[PDB]
Amino acid sequence: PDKKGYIIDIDGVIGKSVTPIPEGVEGVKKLKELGKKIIFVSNNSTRSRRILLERLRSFGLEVGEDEILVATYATARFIAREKPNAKVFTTGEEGLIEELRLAGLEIVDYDEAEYLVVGSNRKINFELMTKALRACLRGIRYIATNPDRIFPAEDGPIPGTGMIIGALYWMTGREPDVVVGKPSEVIMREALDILGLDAKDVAVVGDQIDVDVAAGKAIGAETVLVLTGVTTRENLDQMIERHGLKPDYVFNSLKDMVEAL
Amino acid sequence: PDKKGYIIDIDGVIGKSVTPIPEGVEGVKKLKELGKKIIFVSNNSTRSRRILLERLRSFGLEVGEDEILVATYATARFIAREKPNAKVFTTGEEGLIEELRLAGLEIVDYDEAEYLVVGSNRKINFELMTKALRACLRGIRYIATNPDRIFPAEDGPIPGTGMIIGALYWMTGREPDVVVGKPSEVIMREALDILGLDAKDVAVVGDQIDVDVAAGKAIGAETVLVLTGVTTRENLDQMIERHGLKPDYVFNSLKDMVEAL
Ligand SMILES: [Ca+2]
Ligand SMILES: [Ca+2]
């Protein structure tokens, strides 16, 4: 399982929200120590890159800007490259808006936008869905931060960004033109470019078969599933069957993966 | 074109929201004069029977409450028939809740519900969608008031009930177990029971081919399209094409249908 680089999912691997998984932290540290290059990749739809940077550092990890690729930032830079200073309307929360502005984009009303940017919003309401609907029906280019349907939260499942995607699809027939987040190749090819590595020299590590393992197959990188998050020893067979994908390796935690090098 | 009974769409035939369509109103007056039975059918998921009853009366029509079949009432009667005193969790507005209670049903939280009842809500938010998601995931019986995706408002398109349907489908893979409203046969069968007639003795009149004409076909009743609403002389041929259905009869207005009797 020995590679030049590692594309590492954060949630379920290194932390759970603000709480570090000690075996995941340890594993990262041992990886840096062995001189492996790492990029942390997250589908987080709502927080800016620097929040997640600051979070990893609060876990005790030594991490620079360029080692963090989060969907809010990935999405903003994808647009900006395509169309410098593009006029955008988003359904998303402050951290997405932040990354949009940080990439030089201009935030406008739904009827002036050249891009519709769909990200999750805990403040989603009828007015905001009306605006998205109207933007989508105007036929403007339509980007989504991530496809995730449901987030397994504290008190139970809650809607993810796929809720807005599904609503717009049902009403208009349009899916997004581009989905940025895992398992899309968009965020994955950005991570490779950042690493300066070919897929053949990279492994993709994560806690979800349908997100992280799918992401790795699509760029032709070897895949490692850890059992510190959504996938457990008790549901692994079920998840393999459910998603029709197998990881190249399974480890209890990132620490254990690293002990095998 | 003569029949014992008429299932007549309200919006676009008799009125436009609170505003009367005089040819529509006069048509109803002549149908009653001829001794015909009428049931007024609307997919409105937010308004109680009482409200549509009083609107038709304020148009100068003599109408009793048993001549009014709005989707709120149709949904509540459907559920109460299947399970008296059913416990219901709903996404809907006060007018739906009213009809549910009137039919003897009990409004409860998502984890106590025996039925998920999806109706449109202008005050839809993330908390309501989370409840709807959880109820949906529990596998309980799932009824939608009506399937309409987009309602053409004065300000422009706005989401209909199908927004919530679409969101829930995308997230969970579940479509409603039952759709009440047109063109589903469900509301059309409540209509025939309320009328005490067979489809062969009824004509279905409305302004949308994909809603009313298709509702008429689902019970094999003869269908009449009027041109006082969504469908016009100018777009008639486009609509027949778009929706792949032809009405048995087309008339400028309800008045014209009745003149031809
Ligand atoms: Ca994860
Ligand atoms: Ca109508």
Side-chain angles (χ1 to χ4, degrees):
Chain A
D2 189 291
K3 328 297 301 199
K4 278 170 195 194
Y6 294 85
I7 292 179
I8 305 179
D9 166 40
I10 297 168
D11 226 68
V13 182
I14 296 140
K16 223 156 277 162
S17 182
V18 292
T19 314
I21 308 320
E23 308 102 307
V25 162
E26 283 176 81
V28 165
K29 293 191 190 170
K30 284 85 162 161
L31 276 179
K32 296 180 286 180
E33 233 201 53
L34 263 25
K36 307 304 208 182
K37 302 166 149 250
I38 297 188
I39 183 158
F40 298 100
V41 173
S42 168
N43 274 6
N44 195 299
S45 177
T46 66
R47 307 311 305 272
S48 69
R49 179 169 61 169
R50 189 158 307 269
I51 300 298
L52 288 181
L53 181 56
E54 286 173 12
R55 178 180 305 172
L56 291 185
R57 300 161 166 176
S58 80
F59 295 162
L61 309 189
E62 212 123 288
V63 186
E65 239 171 81
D66 292 325
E67 290 176 286
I68 309 286
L69 191 57
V70 64
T72 52
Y73 169 92
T75 293
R77 300 294 163 159
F78 179 93
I79 300 178
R81 286 173 196 168
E82 233 179 43
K83 183 143 179 191
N85 317 125
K87 296 181 186 41
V88 307
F89 168 82
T90 187
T91 60
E93 295 198 3
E94 305 211 316
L96 178 53
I97 293 173
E98 193 135 39
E99 291 291 348
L100 289 168
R101 279 223 180 74
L102 288 167
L105 305 168
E106 180 182 355
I107 311 297
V108 299
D109 300 341
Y110 72 88
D111 54 1
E112 295 161 342
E114 330 164 40
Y115 285 74
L116 169 58
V117 186
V118 158
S120 197
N121 198 332
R122 202 173 56 76
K123 286 184 172 106
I124 191 69
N125 65 13
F126 195 75
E127 160 167 52
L128 196 42
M129 186 77 69
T130 294
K131 297 190 164 110
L133 167 69
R134 295 178 180 173
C136 192
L137 286 167
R138 282 176 60 212
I140 70 177
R141 178 141 177 88
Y142 167 16
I143 319 287
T145 52
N146 66 297
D148 302 275
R149 280 161 178 80
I150 299 170
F151 175 69
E154 326 195 21
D155 62 301
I158 72 184
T161 300
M163 194 262 269
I164 297 167
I165 297 156
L168 292 176
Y169 170 74
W170 194 265
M171 291 190 291
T172 66
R174 295 192 67 189
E175 300 182 78
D177 298 315
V178 179
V179 179
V180 180
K182 298 174 289 177
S184 182
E185 290 106 315
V186 180
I187 193 165
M188 298 306 286
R189 297 195 185 288
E190 177 69 4
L192 288 186
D193 199 292
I194 288 168
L195 283 168
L197 297 176
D198 187 280
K200 76 188 179 157
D201 287 305
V202 177
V204 171
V205 180
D207 71 328
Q208 294 187 107
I209 301 248
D210 63 321
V211 174
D212 302 294
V213 182
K217 302 257 180 208
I219 44 56
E222 292 193 85
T223 54
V224 175
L225 182 77
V226 293
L227 302 179
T228 41
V230 167
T231 318
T232 65
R233 199 60 85 178
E234 312 87 77
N235 80 3
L236 173 59
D237 300 306
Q238 302 43 56
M239 289 306 184
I240 287 162
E241 259 287 342
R242 175 91 56 75
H243 305 296
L245 295 178
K246 280 209 311 130
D248 298 312
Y249 308 92
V250 184
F251 289 105
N252 276 327
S253 68
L254 183 67
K255 159 179 141 299
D256 298 330
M257 180 197 89
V258 178
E259 290 172 351
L261 300 177
Chain B
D2 201 63
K3 238 80 201 188
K4 289 175 184 196
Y6 292 82
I7 300 174
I8 306 175
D9 172 41
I10 303 183
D11 276 314
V13 179
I14 308 292
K16 271 134 178 68
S17 149
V18 165
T19 304
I21 299 162
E23 299 97 340
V25 172
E26 193 185 329
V28 168
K29 286 172 179 173
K30 282 180 133 265
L31 272 174
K32 290 288 223 155
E33 219 166 83
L34 279 149
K36 303 312 200 182
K37 288 160 56 78
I38 300 176
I39 186 166
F40 296 102
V41 180
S42 160
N43 270 16
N44 198 308
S45 80
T46 65
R47 292 304 178 248
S48 64
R49 173 153 69 148
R50 172 173 73 84
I51 290 197
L52 277 302
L53 179 61
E54 292 298 335
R55 177 194 297 158
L56 299 189
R57 278 158 186 188
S58 71
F59 288 162
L61 301 165
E62 199 294 312
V63 196
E65 64 170 17
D66 284 350
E67 298 173 294
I68 305 294
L69 191 57
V70 60
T72 59
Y73 173 55
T75 300
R77 82 185 258 137
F78 180 90
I79 297 174
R81 178 181 273 104
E82 214 173 62
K83 181 131 141 73
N85 310 125
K87 297 145 145 77
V88 182
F89 165 76
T90 189
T91 57
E93 298 195 0
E94 179 55 35
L96 182 46
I97 293 160
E98 183 181 328
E99 293 297 340
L100 297 166
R101 289 177 160 142
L102 281 167
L105 305 175
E106 191 190 342
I107 309 297
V108 309
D109 303 342
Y110 67 86
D111 48 5
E112 311 187 2
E114 295 165 314
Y115 284 83
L116 168 61
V117 181
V118 163
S120 205
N121 196 328
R122 274 203 94 96
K123 291 304 214 300
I124 184 81
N125 59 17
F126 192 83
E127 180 183 71
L128 247 201
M129 189 67 67
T130 293
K131 291 181 174 160
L133 167 64
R134 288 170 188 181
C136 197
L137 288 177
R138 289 182 49 214
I140 68 177
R141 189 146 169 78
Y142 165 20
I143 317 287
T145 51
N146 68 118
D148 302 82
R149 296 165 191 220
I150 289 175
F151 174 90
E154 295 291 344
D155 24 309
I158 78 196
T161 298
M163 195 261 272
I164 299 174
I165 294 175
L168 288 177
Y169 168 73
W170 201 262
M171 291 189 288
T172 70
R174 293 190 68 195
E175 292 178 78
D177 294 308
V178 176
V179 180
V180 174
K182 294 172 293 177
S184 169
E185 82 284 351
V186 169
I187 194 172
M188 307 300 281
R189 287 159 19 205
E190 298 294 320
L192 302 177
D193 291 356
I194 289 168
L195 283 167
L197 297 182
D198 275 332
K200 60 154 191 167
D201 287 318
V202 164
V204 174
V205 180
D207 73 331
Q208 304 177 97
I209 293 175
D210 54 316
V211 178
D212 306 287
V213 173
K217 292 195 202 289
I219 58 167
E222 294 191 29
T223 57
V224 183
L225 189 64
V226 297
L227 301 179
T228 42
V230 168
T231 298
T232 65
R233 255 142 37 97
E234 292 56 33
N235 69 18
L236 169 53
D237 285 302
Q238 297 89 299
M239 297 292 159
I240 283 175
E241 291 258 66
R242 181 176 156 181
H243 302 120
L245 284 181
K246 260 177 212 138
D248 297 318
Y249 314 86
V250 186
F251 291 108
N252 286 318
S253 74
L254 196 61
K255 169 175 162 282
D256 305 310
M257 190 193 77
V258 182
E259 317 286 33
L261 295 198

